[PDB]
A paper describes a structure:
[name]-β is synthesized as a latent form (L-[name]-β) containing a 25-kDa N-terminal latency-associated peptide (LAP) and a 12-kDa C-terminal growth factor (mTGF-β) domain. Myeloid lineage cells present the latent form of transforming growth factor-β1 (L-[name]-β1) to the membrane using an anchor protein [name]. Integrin αVβ8 activates extracellular L-[name]-β1 to trigger the downstream signaling functions.
We used a αVβ8/L-[name]-β1/[name] ternary complex of 2:2:1 stoichiometry for structural determination, in which integrin αVβ8 contains only the headpiece involved in L-[name]-β1 binding (i.e., residues 1–594 of αV subunit and residues 1–456 of β8 subunit). To understand the interactions between integrin αVβ8 and L-[name]-β1, we focused on one αVβ8 headpiece and the L-[name]-β1 dimer within the EM map. In contrast to other integrins whose headpieces adopt an open conformation upon ligand binding, the αVβ8 headpiece remains closed in complex with L-[name]-β119,31. However, the adjacent proximal loop (207−INGFTTGR−214) and integrin-binding (IB) helix (218−LATIHGM−224) of L-[name]-β1 undergo tremendous conformational changes. Moreover, Tyr172 of integrin β8 forms hydrogen bond with Thr212 to fix the proximal loop in the new position.
Author numbering:
A (entry chain B): 72 to 395, 404 to 424
B (entry chain A): 1 to 454, 474 to 501, 519 to 540, 559 to 588
C (entry chain D): 76 to 193, 207 to 239
Write the structure that this text describes.
Amino acid sequence: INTQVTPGEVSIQLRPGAEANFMLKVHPLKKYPVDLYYLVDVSASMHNNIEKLNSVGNDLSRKMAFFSRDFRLGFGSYVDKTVSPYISIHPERIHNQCSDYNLDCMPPHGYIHVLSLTENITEFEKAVHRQKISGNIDTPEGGFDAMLQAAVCESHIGWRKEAKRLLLVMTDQTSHLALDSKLAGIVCPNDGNCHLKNNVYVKSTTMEHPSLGQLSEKLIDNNINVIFAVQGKQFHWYKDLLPLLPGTIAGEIESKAANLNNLVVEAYQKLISEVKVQVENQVQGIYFNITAICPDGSRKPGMEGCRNVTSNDEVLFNVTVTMKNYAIIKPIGFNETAKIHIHRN
Amino acid sequence: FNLDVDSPAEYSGPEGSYFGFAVDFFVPSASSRMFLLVGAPKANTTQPGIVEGGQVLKCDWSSTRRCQPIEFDATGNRDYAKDDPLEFKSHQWFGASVRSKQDKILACAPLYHWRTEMKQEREPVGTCFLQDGTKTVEYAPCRSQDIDADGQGFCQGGFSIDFTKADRVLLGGPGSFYWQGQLISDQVAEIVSKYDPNVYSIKYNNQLATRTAQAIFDDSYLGYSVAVGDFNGDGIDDFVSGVPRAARTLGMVYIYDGKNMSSLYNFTGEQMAAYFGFSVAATDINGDDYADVFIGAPLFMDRGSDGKLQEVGQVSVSLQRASGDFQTTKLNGFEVFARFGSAIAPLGDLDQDGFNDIAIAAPYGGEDKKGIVYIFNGRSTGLNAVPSQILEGQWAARSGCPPSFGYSMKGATDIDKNGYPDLIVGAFGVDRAILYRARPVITVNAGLEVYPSIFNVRFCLKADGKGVLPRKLNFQVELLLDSPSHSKNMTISRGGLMQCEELIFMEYRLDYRTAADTTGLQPILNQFTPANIS
Amino acid sequence: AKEVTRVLMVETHNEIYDKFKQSTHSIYMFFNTSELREAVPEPVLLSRAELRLLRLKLKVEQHVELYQKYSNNSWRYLSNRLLAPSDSPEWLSFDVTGVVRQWLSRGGEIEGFRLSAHINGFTTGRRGDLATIHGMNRPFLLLMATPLERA
Ligand SMILES: *[C@@H]1O[C@H](CO)[C@@H](O[C@@H]2O[C@H](CO)[C@@H](O[C@@H]3O[C@H](CO)[C@@H](O[C@H]4O[C@H](CO[C@H]5O[C@H](CO)[C@@H](O)[C@H](O)[C@@H]5O)[C@@H](O)[C@H](O)[C@@H]4O)[C@H](O[C@H]4O[C@H](CO)[C@@H](O)[C@H](O)[C@@H]4O)[C@@H]3O)[C@H](O)[C@H]2NC(C)=O)[C@H](O)[C@H]1NC(C)=O
Ligand SMILES: *[C@@H]1O[C@H](CO)[C@@H](O[C@@H]2O[C@H](CO)[C@@H](O[C@@H]3O[C@H](CO)[C@@H](O)[C@H](O)[C@H]3NC(C)=O)[C@H](O)[C@H]2NC(C)=O)[C@H](O)[C@H]1NC(C)=O
Ligand SMILES: *[C@@H]1O[C@H](CO)[C@@H](O[C@@H]2O[C@H](CO)[C@@H](O)[C@H](O)[C@H]2NC(C)=O)[C@H](O)[C@H]1NC(C)=O
Ligand SMILES: *[C@@H]1O[C@H](CO)[C@@H](O[C@@H]2O[C@H](CO)[C@@H](O)[C@H](O)[C@H]2NC(C)=O)[C@H](O)[C@H]1NC(C)=O
Ligand SMILES: *[C@@H]1O[C@H](CO)[C@@H](O)[C@H](O)[C@H]1NC(C)=O
Ligand SMILES: *[C@@H]1O[C@H](CO)[C@@H](O)[C@H](O)[C@H]1NC(C)=O
Ligand SMILES: *[C@@H]1O[C@H](CO)[C@@H](O)[C@H](O)[C@H]1NC(C)=O
Ligand SMILES: *[C@@H]1O[C@H](CO)[C@@H](O)[C@H](O)[C@H]1NC(C)=O
Ligand SMILES: *[C@@H]1O[C@H](CO)[C@@H](O)[C@H](O)[C@H]1NC(C)=O
Ligand SMILES: [Ca+2]
Ligand SMILES: [Ca+2]
Ligand SMILES: [Ca+2]
Ligand SMILES: [Ca+2]
Ligand SMILES: [Ca+2]
Ligand SMILES: [Mn+2]
């Protein structure tokens, strides 16, 4: 049934105190359909990155034409929460934060879904030009909320179950954390559901920023691969965040800020070459131990799995389920799942 | 482990007013009646033009648990010119932080949007209201001539406050110097004496505060949580501040000096973006007379057996020594996404065993996110890892925003005069403030003598307690063979000798009916003693 | 009476930050000669040229050191000025008529002035997200030249 993962389902019965291992074969394929999303910050600190993003549209298609065979592209923007002290609530500055500079800039917004994933690219070049720049007061810019909203709301974005989901988030500075909203007064957590009324996050002033762990769990559940394209000194900061976020890598952008297509190519190649698997087990009494086998011959069990792997290279995952409902074990970023059913007795 | 869970004092308030955001005790020295302080930042007042201004309700502890708010500033928005609002008190979140000394009540609004003299922008500076008796004064530390977010524009004063034993008040505003932070400490006498409503800057003569740091120190959130404690042994409590945003978003704790703001020690978190220093409390745990530092990290991710990261939370305890070195012990969370360590509040010597006790609560744990509160005891070497008592919320979620039981609590203040510091827990989601009373703790020693072992069985026992207790107690015992059982209702006075008798493995039960006092507190047995021998 | 004109500077990222990317010690304003020739062709027709700058809220001490580009390999000193400690964006005017007149007929790739110490169009002074935003009144070269037909 399943394509990438060889066993569709394995049903094993085991008495407590005795172990019962099985075989979990993984065979990555070639020419993965790609659904790439652009979560770009339109804050005032990126008056040049917005114009740098202009030319990616037609050019990246040529590069992707010989990795994948079908490409679908979308767009998105985010600034920050529409509250104080993040933004200025002055009557003259509530709608335009560039009044003191006498500049025409977009009003700040939590998250706006400008354009969904479409085969048409001409829609992308039309969409990049009609969106202006925005800004606010405080240095950090809330991006994790935009990631959560672009991941959970699958219907609005238009993700495909048969394609490799890709959410490429670009920032230069640090993002707002979960409990930073206590200054504004919002003191209860994000639920994590869909709250996009009409391509706009209306629930940006009544709920806090999502937790890092909750965001990672939602990304894993939605099979979303994230590329952290950054240009500032915070490249190191986002690089140290990679162990915290499973199936996520970060790349560097130069000051001249034109290696976006190459960065995307390298990120896609790295994501395809990494195979990591984690088990989301809810059954009580069972213990999960995973022993990964690499094509290179180096036995490297654990969450890291095997790197530098391509097609026609079968990666083995020896799992020994023991005892002291079903549990789903699946690779990160793979559209298929390996659900195991156990006999409770 | 002595908290009464079968009859907690429950306080109601205005619906949808965050009743229970800040809870604190009120124990006036002049009067013999000790009141209570609860916060409701979203409670509508009688002020003209003020919507959801907020108020600090004062609740009584007597049988008629009726509550009423305290009048602090019963007037509308001030004016700077004709048809010009000098203040924007709407949505000011008044009463977010409440701290009370013997007879001084300090209610602080962190969203006090005072328009500046010249720029006249709605930047919130944050003020406080200090009341001691009939006279009331207004305290505005962040309101000064350094305007805009550079110096003090978004200072947001009154976010976290504390009172020093040396008759001093510590105020921390995390938004100063582009959200770097500040620690403004002032003497109560100067504020009380110099109260001129005409002047706004209200510059003081003994005002010491941290100055602006370097550019890379931006977004530090200094003063996010404040505490008072003695470290160098000079007779004045030092200042402890939580810094969960410095060190390139790693987590830090800054310790200053109450004399001239000298940096004594520092702390650093281990995990990036782990919220190190979100809530800091200073209290002793091993009875060495040295004030230790308690630091809790709500959002902490740990590595499991399979490497799957789980957000359970982590609380770090620092054991201060005579030399000055700090021994840090990490207490991991118990439930995923429970935000363990969000609120930390000392309880003092809860069970009167010498060592003090502390409480750490998880506001989003349990079934349906009803909030879980953990009670931790104290040892000579740190504190007991496993919890000693579990407190659970009995109210479900009214709306999407969860009740968050245990988000803020106050303790270490005796109210019923039994010698046991009671604890109040306030949840703003369901607009209730719950007070838990400490049941009497009776330590009991049991001894069985059998001679010869190859017959005479003669069991003996004694009872002792701390505080006010009934003079006479009732105990029920039992007998087992290998009539096989003999029950007996005996009476042992407090401090008595071996109550020995013979009958021709024992289990003892305390009578919860006759031992109950007039209020209804049933004495609880010691959990650290065994109930059977041989 | 005399005709006036304005010569805008180059973009901060296009040509200003080409080799002098981080000129923290002194802010640099660069120009090229094509726009100066467009403003007025005749070097002798330039009756007067002025440099317009917007002062910041220093209010402590202002000492500006004015160097100029001699053959793009040395420095040239003309004069110095001070800014009154006033919390207002006051307008500054410098007499650079000789330099502009010399550069109008002198072929070159880029020319500029050093403003050392011993502003609109640049960093405002609010560190963070409101630092690198540009606005109008970007530093330009004010010119007062007579029309060719009249003279
Ligand atoms: C526990 O952690 C604490 C937090 O990390 C730490 O506190 C930090 O201590 C260090 C040193 O002990 C301290 O660094 C000093 O900061 C001084 C300002 O408070 C600074 O004074 C100079 O700068 C002031 C403002 O800086 C601006 O202006 C400067 C020009 O004046 C400019 O160069 C700067 O870049 C910036 O724009 C200024 O007002 C003042 O007049 C001084 O000029 C110190 O500078 C020293 O270094 C210069 C060379 O750069 C020398 O000329 C001279 O020796 C100066 O003294 C110095 O940088 C941090 O500020 C503290 N941080 C906080 C927050 O308080 C504790 O020390 C730690 N405890 C332990 C036991 O480790
Ligand atoms: C996860 O992604 C995989 C890779 O994109 C999917 O695998 C392939 O799915 C295609 C679906 O678009 C299949 O194409 C169709 O397959 C059916 C067989 O059931 C044929 O009748 C159709 O003609 C064919 N359509 C074409 C070729 O246009 C591929 O055959 C299939 N395998 C390969 C090697 O490409 C997974 O389906 C997807 N999983 C889920 C749950 O969506
Ligand atoms: C406080 O008073 C206001 C109005 O007197 C109540 O209504 C809130 O304010 C306006 C009314 O036009 C609405 O936009 C808000 O949505 C109302 N709030 C809610 C929660 O409905 C408000 O309910 C009062 N609050 C309390 C706690 O009594
Ligand atoms: C005021 O601050 C000064 C400087 O921070 C303090 O002087 C130092 O204090 C520490 C703490 O005991 C000593 O270890 C140093 O030897 C002192 N001298 C230095 C650093 O040169 C001073 O103690 C503080 N208090 C008072 C009352 O002056
Ligand atoms: C979308 O692509 C189709 C395919 O050629 C093309 O005909 C159409 O014009 C494109 N849309 C736009 C808006 O250009
Ligand atoms: C699980 O298996 C691994 C690899 O075989 C080995 O370290 C050990 O047997 C188990 N490890 C743990 C941590 O349970
Ligand atoms: C998996 O590991 C177990 C030991 O835990 C071993 O007995 C078994 O043979 C291994 N399976 C494979 C396919 O190597
Ligand atoms: C002891 O006291 C209990 C309750 O007061 C009573 O029910 C019982 O009859 C008494 N006597 C014995 C032998 O238990
Ligand atoms: C150079 O001069 C031309 C003249 O048309 C002008 O358009 C341009 O902005 C100037 N600066 C450059 C090319 O950096
Ligand atoms: Ca921001
Ligand atoms: Ca001290
Ligand atoms: Ca101690
Ligand atoms: Ca104790
Ligand atoms: Ca009590
Ligand atoms: Mn920004």
